[PDB]
């Protein structure tokens, strides 16, 4: 029935609304220019430093701790609303667990997504904003790991996908049976099912003259892989150069054993 995953469709933005401070409704009215709302722009040392009065040590290093933070929060966040997903809580324990791990990364790239123009990042809940060029400009080997990021979130973007239709679409992401390690399949199978069903149902109601964008959402998700790929490489090459750099204990968790 058509109804029952309009319903679900509902229950599922809900949680998602609750279960993330920031939105890309919110996110895109702070970017597009929607006065109170506009954030600090940090392009240089000087914007960065000026910031910590406006906004709540190596330059780089302490970049990449605010995005450790930043990404401990996420999972947080993205744990609190795989909860709230029919039937999650009730899978075998050991698989709830699996599901998040490889789910949060492809997650937090979405998610980023959102804050995500060409330009940069939104930062400190849309309080402050990060430029592209800046965040390249941190030396070797930290400048380059920002920018993959940006590079889906512009293809991306053009999907130009509402809140409701990514609150379903990552709920598919999660409950996914592919996952290695699963100890059983049969029945996140079943609900990603219904999740797709939703999604279907969603993306042509909300996008009846997108065409093919089922499909096309579906897709990038190959994308999405592909980041996570390149990411652990990154980061493992971190922990190497830089001995003197703590590891967060649920980062680590979710990061290693991982494909
Ligand atoms: C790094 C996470 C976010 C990138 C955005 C901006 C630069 C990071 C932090 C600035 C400080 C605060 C912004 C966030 C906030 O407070 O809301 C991307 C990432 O996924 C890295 C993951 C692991 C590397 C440790």
Not at 47 to 75: H, N, P, T, Y
Not at 93 to 100: E, I, R
Not at 226 to 234: K, M
Request: net charge negative.
């Amino acid at each position: 029935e058509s109804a029952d995953l309009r319903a679900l469709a509902k229950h599922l933005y809900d949680s998602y609304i609750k279960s993330f401070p920031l939105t890309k409704a919110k996110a895109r009215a702070i970017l597009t220019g929607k006065t109170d709302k506009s954030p600090f722009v940090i392009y240089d040392m000087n914007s960065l430093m000026m910031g910590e009065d406006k906004i709540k040590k190596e330059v780089a290093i302490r970049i990449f701790q605010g995005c450790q933070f930043r990404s401990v929060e996420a999972v947080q966040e993205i744990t609190e609303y795989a909860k709230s997903i029919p039937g999650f809580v009730n899978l075998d324990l050991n698989d709830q667990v699996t599901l998040l791990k490889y789910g949060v990364h492809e997650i937090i790239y979405t998610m980023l997504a959102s804050l995500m123009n060409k330009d940069g990042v939104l930062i400190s809940e849309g309080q402050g904003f990060m430029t592209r060029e800046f965040l390249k400009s941190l030396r070797k080997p930290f400048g380059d790991f920002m920018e993959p990021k940006f590079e889906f979130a512009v293809k991306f973007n053009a999907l130009e996908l509402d809140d409701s239709d990514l609150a379903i679409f990552i709920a598919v992401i999660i409950l996914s049976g592919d996952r290695p390690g699963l100890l059983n399949v049969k029945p996140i199978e079943d609900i990603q099912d219904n999740l797709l069903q939703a999604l279907e149902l969603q993306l042509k109601l909300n996008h009846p003259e997108s065409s093919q964008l089922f499909a096309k959402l579906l897709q990038k998700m190959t994308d999405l892989r592909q980041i996570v790929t390149e990411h652990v490489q990154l980061l493992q090459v971190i922990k190497k150069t830089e001995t003197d750099m703590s590891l967060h204990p649920l980062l680590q968790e979710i990061y290693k054993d991982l494909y």
